[PDB]
Amino acid sequence: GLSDGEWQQVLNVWGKVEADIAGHGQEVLIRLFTGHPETLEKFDKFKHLKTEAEMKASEDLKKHGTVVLTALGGILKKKGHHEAELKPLAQSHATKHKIPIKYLEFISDAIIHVLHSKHPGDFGADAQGAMTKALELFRNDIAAKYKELGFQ
Numbered sequence: 001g002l003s004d005g006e007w008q009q010v011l012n013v014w015g016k017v018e019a020d021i022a023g024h025g026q027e028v029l030i031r032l033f034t035g036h037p038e039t040l041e042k043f044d045k046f047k048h049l050k051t052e053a054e055m056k057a058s059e060d061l062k063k064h065g066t067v068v069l070t071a072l073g074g075i076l077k078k079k080g081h082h083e084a085e086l087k088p089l090a091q092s093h094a095t096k097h098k099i100p101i102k103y104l105e106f107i108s109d110a111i112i113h114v115l116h117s118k119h120p121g122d123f124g125a126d127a128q129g130a131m132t133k134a135l136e137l138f139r140n141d142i143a144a145k146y147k148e149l150g151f152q
């Protein structure tokens, strides 16, 4: 549950992402894959990437980063009223991709890391607080659907 002022912070931060969605999305995925190499194994189309240089050179990885961040941005812009947008993603991630909730925690922290790396000194404590709460809400609503499905 976020206040109006917290949502305002989230959507202000998101403007930084929307200025370069592909660059942010690329770096988010690289932070996830290099920090948590088991996550790469869930992607049949990226498992061939052995080095970070290959990850950086991959145009398809940047494309997928755009897909991921476009979806998250659509959810965040709903300011919590995201049941219709979140349901298909919870269902596909539990039943087809088999993504444990832990990996959604990993990517949430990766987003925070990338924002500080690309905007050092321009991602303040209030903005970090609000972004963190928004990603927690996203993860928590996914977790509820995972429990419904019995997925671990």
Ligand code: HEM
Residues within 6 Å of the ligand: 039, 040, 042, 043, 044, 045, 067, 068, 069, 071, 072, 088, 089, 092, 093, 097, 099, 103, 104, 107
């Ligand atoms: C911010 C969180 C994330 C968002 C919004 C997101 C969004 C999406 C979207 C929109 C798709 C394509 C449509 C679909 O299959 O439902 C997708 C595909 C996928 N997601 Fe996620 N995702 C997230 C996190 C993750 C994480 C943490 C993993 C694994 C560690 C992952 C693994 C996958 C895989 C395996 C695919 C299929 C890729 C393919 O072969 O084309 N996702 N995701």
